[PDB]
């Protein structure tokens, strides 16, 4: 899997809800963009990463840019994939995420 192949974009409202997701998210994590709309990213985070991700978000919201560092994202058919995400606030109107899958 090439680097471009492990990267997908997502867009979020200020409350973390998906408003847009690349179709690439499908072959990586199972979900279809269509079924992610309106659901908060927070629902998909491993419990052990929840607080870190809340803080990453808080740093994004005040500074405009953030690197999540590593976190586990719940796959559609069970299991957690590791990800890293660069987030950017577009002014606030939305959050743009460039998400890279650290797993296999």
């Amino acid at each position: 899997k090439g680097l471009d192949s492990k990267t997908f974009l997502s867009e979020h409202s200020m409350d973390m809800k998906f408003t847009y997701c690349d179709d690439r998210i499908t072959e990586l994590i199972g979900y279809h963009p269509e079924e992610l709309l309106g659901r908060s990213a927070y629902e998909f985070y491993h419990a052990l990463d929840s607080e870190n991700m809340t803080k990453s978000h808080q740093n994004l919201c005040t500074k405009g840019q953030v690197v999540s560092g590593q976190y586990r994202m719940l796959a559609k058919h069970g299991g957690y994939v590791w990800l890293e995400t660069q987030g950017t606030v577009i002014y606030p109107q939305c959050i743009m995420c460039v998400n890279y899958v650290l797993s296999e």
């Binding site: 840019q65 743009m96 460039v98």
Partner: protein
Amino acid sequence: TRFISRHNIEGIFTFVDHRCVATVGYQPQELLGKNIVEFCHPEDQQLLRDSFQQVVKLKGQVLSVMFRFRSKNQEWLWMRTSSFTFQNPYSDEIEYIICTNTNVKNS
């Protein structure tokens, strides 16, 4: 409303979200391959070229540009494009530009 696109540093569309139909009237394949500057108003072409040139020097920070974009239905629409470079720090591939493109009021 708005649509995301990705470009190479020369301005060429390399990815376009389907939200573009409702925003500017084209299908993704009518944009893919072409340089964004080909859809831009001749008075705004240079500002736009210079903006692509600068976004790659701003250390992955957000650069915003406002320009007129020729919709499929023929008309000049005012667009606000906020853009930023991304480069996967695991690799040394050339960065590319991620854009969000919104129809805004000039007023």
